[PDB]
Design a protein around this motif. Structure first.
Motif, PDB file in Angstrom:
ATOM      1  N   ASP A  88       0.844  -1.186   0.000  1.00 24.19           N
ATOM      2  CA  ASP A  88       0.000   0.000   0.000  1.00 24.19           C
ATOM      3  C   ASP A  88       0.885   1.244   0.000  1.00 24.19           C
ATOM      4  OD1 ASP A  88       1.020  -0.082   2.524  1.00 24.19           O
ATOM      5  OD2 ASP A  88      -0.886   0.257   3.556  1.00 24.19           O
ATOM      6  N   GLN A  89       0.272   2.413   0.182  1.00 20.96           N
ATOM      7  CA  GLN A  89       1.044   3.649   0.218  1.00 20.96           C
ATOM      8  C   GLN A  89       2.114   3.603   1.300  1.00 20.96           C
ATOM      9  OE1 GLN A  89      -1.770   3.210  -0.823  1.00 20.96           O
ATOM     10  NE2 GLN A  89      -1.799   4.405  -2.724  1.00 20.96           N
ATOM     11  N   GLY A  90       1.837   2.927   2.412  1.00 22.49           N
ATOM     12  CA  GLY A  90       2.779   2.783   3.499  1.00 22.49           C
ATOM     13  C   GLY A  90       3.729   1.615   3.383  1.00 22.49           C
ATOM     14  N   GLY A  91       3.642   0.831   2.312  1.00 20.25           N
ATOM     15  CA  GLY A  91       4.534  -0.299   2.143  1.00 20.25           C
ATOM     16  C   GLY A  91       4.147  -1.531   2.924  1.00 20.25           C
ATOM     17  N   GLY A 111       0.209  -6.720   4.828  1.00 13.74           N
ATOM     18  CA  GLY A 111      -0.758  -7.370   5.686  1.00 13.74           C
ATOM     19  C   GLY A 111      -0.384  -7.225   7.143  1.00 13.74           C
ATOM     20  N   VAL A 112      -1.263  -7.755   7.989  1.00 13.50           N
ATOM     21  CA  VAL A 112      -1.080  -7.755   9.436  1.00 13.50           C
ATOM     22  C   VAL A 112      -1.470  -9.128   9.963  1.00 13.50           C
ATOM     23  CG1 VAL A 112      -1.476  -6.472  11.563  1.00 13.50           C
ATOM     24  CG2 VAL A 112      -1.813  -5.350   9.361  1.00 13.50           C
ATOM     25  N   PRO A 169      -0.310   1.725  11.935  1.00 13.40           N
ATOM     26  CA  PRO A 169       0.779   1.173  11.123  1.00 13.40           C
ATOM     27  C   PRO A 169       2.103   1.019  11.853  1.00 13.40           C
ATOM     28  CG  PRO A 169      -0.225   3.136  10.118  1.00 13.40           C
ATOM     29  CD  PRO A 169      -0.611   3.110  11.544  1.00 13.40           C
ATOM     30  N   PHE A 170       2.211   1.459  13.104  1.00 16.54           N
ATOM     31  CA  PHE A 170       3.484   1.457  13.812  1.00 16.54           C
ATOM     32  C   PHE A 170       3.512   0.469  14.971  1.00 16.54           C
ATOM     33  CE2 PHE A 170       7.213   3.669  15.725  1.00 16.54           C
ATOM     34  CZ  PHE A 170       7.988   3.686  14.586  1.00 16.54           C
ATOM     35  N   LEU A 171       2.490  -0.370  15.108  1.00 20.98           N
ATOM     36  CA  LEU A 171       2.491  -1.447  16.090  1.00 20.98           C
ATOM     37  C   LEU A 171       3.020  -2.711  15.424  1.00 20.98           C
ATOM     38  CD1 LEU A 171      -0.866  -0.956  18.014  1.00 20.98           C
ATOM     39  CD2 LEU A 171       1.395  -1.083  19.057  1.00 20.98           C
ATOM     40  N   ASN A 172       4.172  -3.192  15.884  1.00 21.14           N
ATOM     41  CA  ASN A 172       4.813  -4.333  15.249  1.00 21.14           C
ATOM     42  C   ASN A 172       5.724  -5.028  16.250  1.00 21.14           C
ATOM     43  OD1 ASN A 172       5.451  -6.144  13.241  1.00 21.14           O
ATOM     44  ND2 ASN A 172       6.947  -4.816  12.235  1.00 21.14           N
TER      45      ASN A 172
END
Ligand code: NAD
Length: 255
Positions: free
Chosen positions: A136-139, A142-143, A238-241
């Motif tokens: 996506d735009q953020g690269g 999936g999650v 998008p920053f939870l990983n």
RNA sequence: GUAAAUAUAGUUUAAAAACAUCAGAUUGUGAAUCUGACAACAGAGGCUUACCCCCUUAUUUACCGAGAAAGCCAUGCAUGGCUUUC
């Protein structure tokens, strides 16, 4: 929003998986309830509408999960989110001196197979499926969100095998996140506490009241809707990983 | 203050049970148990086999003085006022 996303929810016919499927489909997403053939998941899938389908599969079998993901890809065209909620609980002491009883190896092995090995099987196959998605735009492709337990941190008496499997999930969360970072797939784990699911509501009312009183605040069993809300929050952020989040109401289990 | 009733010491209905209480049990999901602790119908006093009463506190309820007889006045045989008697 999560409209247009496709979610493969293992153990999605009951409890936390069912709550996650209900919430996500309600927001406009598409859900695949990957569950056992005799778990009554077809009824839930029909009740959830057209955007929900049922995949009879055993997470411990590579072929079953492969067929489930093939069905998901054919029905909806891709996979965006994976929620590993399939699992079993077993209570058994490691050794009872008074009774001379020893923990059976089969119980430990089957708990491991269902929880840890099943989670990894689903994770690897669905990561292979997601790798085909255009970033996506953020690269992000999936999650993946796994269900651990607080037993992975303060497991009680008789939770040796369950704690082993959940601690394995916790330990493998970060390595898998690092593995899939080049592919742009986020990997997260939720460690719920005591939730009002069929795994707990089947106990006598007095036990349920005691468990509710054991939660500091709110003094009640967790609602599966809260688990679904946390899952959606992880999906949207998008920053939870590579992190484990304890959704337990500040409880710490006694021995 | 004086007469009535009423008084369940964890609770209730009865006239003994149910729900409860304390101690121990690492209980495999009926522990929905097992082993124990407690068990006083307000408080004290007899008296005949058994036959009930008397008393003290506590709660609730109501709480101390003019009949008839005769003679007169007024009202419409009845009523009001007064005078002498017990
Ligand atoms: N219930 C709790 O309080 C609690 C707390 C912490 C963690 N967890 C974990 O959360 C997850 C959610 O389960 P839940 O609480 O809803 O219980 P649940 O039994 O309602 O959900 C488990 C689901 O997994 C499915 N499943 C089981 N084995 C499977 C298999 N081999 N293949 C495919 N599907 C399978 C079941 O059919 C069911 O739909 C479980 O992994 C559970 O251990 C639960």
């Amino acid at each position: 929003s999560v409209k247009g996303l496709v979610a493969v929810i293992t153990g999605g016919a009951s409890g936390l998986g069912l709550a996650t499927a209900e919430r996500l489909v309600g927001q406009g997403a598409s859900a695949v309830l990957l569950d056992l053939p005799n778990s009554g998941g077809e009824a839930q899938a029909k009740k959830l509408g057209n955007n929900c389908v049922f995949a009879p599969a055993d997470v411990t079998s590579e072929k079953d999960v492969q067929t489930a993901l093939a069905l998901a890809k054919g029905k909806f065209g891709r996979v965006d989110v994976a929620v590993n909620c399939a699992g079993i609980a077993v209570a058994s002491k490691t050794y009872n001196l008074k009774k001379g009883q020893t923990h059976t190896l089969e119980d430990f092995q089957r708990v491991l197979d269902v929880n840890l090995m099943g989670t990894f099987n689903v994770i690897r196959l669905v990561a292979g499926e997601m790798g085909q998605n255009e970033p996506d735009q953020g690269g992000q492709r999936g999650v993946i969100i796994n269900t651990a337990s607080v037993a992975a941190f303060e497991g009680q008496v008789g939770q040796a095998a369950y704690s082993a499997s959940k601690g394995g999930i916790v330990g493998m969360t970060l390595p898998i996140a690092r593995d899939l970072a080049p592919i742009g797939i986020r990997v997260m784990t939720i460690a719920p506490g005591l939730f009002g699911t069929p795994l707990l509501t089947s106990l006598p009312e007095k036990v349920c009241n005691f468990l509710a009183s054991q939660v500091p605040f709110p003094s009640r069993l967790g609602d599966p809707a809260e688990y679904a809300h946390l899952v959606q929050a992880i999906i949207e952020n998008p920053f939870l990983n590579g992190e484990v989040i304890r959704l337990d109401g500040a409880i710490r289990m006694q021995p």
